[PDB]
Design a protein around this ligand. Structure first.
Ligand code: MTA
Length: 195
């Protein structure tokens, strides 16, 4: 149903902007919240590319989104799923029946998801998306494929640590989802930034 990203960076680097943009395009602005922005954040501090796409953002943390958005169902104990790389159980399609909200770490990893968990010990229930680390947009892409499209994790086709060779080179230490044409799905604009 609804996707929440907890922003755990200060600002918005080009990478973050591209990821969040892709997320906005795939889940729809009405189904995404960016929460836990720094206390002094105002509209001026939010990238115009994300505002343009209808980004719903808040400086409130998980325990406050309901105060801010009457549209959202009460974040209720046990019905919010934390996508957690160190969880003992992988998300499966029937979990769609068991959670209304899916929470992701707004991070650019070099763990931090455990800080998210520890922060809200009674709210969140963890589910994993496999044994290898994904970018936020890949994690959200996979979650949607499981919850909305009901594909088992094990039927999804990934690439582990793809190399992008522009001439006779960068390898991304993340797991990526494959498109029908067998290419890794990247946020629009990401490849140029990599080059
Ligand atoms: C820093 S990665 C961005 C976020 O995507 C989610 N995520 C990334 N990789 C995985 C994984 N293997 N399993 C579950 N969730 C993940 C986590 O919520 C993480 O904070």
């Amino acid at each position: 149903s609804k996707y929440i990203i907890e922003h755990m960076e200060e600002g918005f680097s080009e990478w973050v902007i591209l990821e969040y943009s892709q997320i906005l395009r795939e889940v729809g602005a009405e189904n995404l919240i960016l929460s836990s922005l720094p206390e002094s954040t105002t509209e001026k501090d939010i990238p115009q590319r994300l505002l343009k796409l209808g980004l719903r953002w808040t400086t409130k943390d998980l325990k406050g989104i309901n105060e801010d958005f009457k549209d959202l169902e009460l974040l209720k104990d046990g019905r919010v799923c934390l996508l957690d790389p160190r969880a003992t159980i992988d998300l499966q399609p029937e979990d769609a029946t068991k959670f209304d909200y899916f929470v992701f770490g707004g991070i650019l990893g070099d763990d931090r998801t455990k800080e998210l968990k520890t922060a809200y010990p009674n709210l969140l229930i963890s589910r994993r998306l496999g044994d290898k680390q994904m970018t936020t947009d890949t994690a959200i892409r996979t979650t949607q494929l499981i919850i909305k499209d009901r594909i088992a994790f094990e039927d999804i086709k990934f690439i582990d640590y793809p190399e992008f060779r522009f001439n006779k080179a960068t390898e991304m230490p993340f797991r990526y989802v494959l498109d029908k044409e067998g290419k890794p799905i990247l946020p629009e604009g990401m490849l140029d930034l990599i080059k």
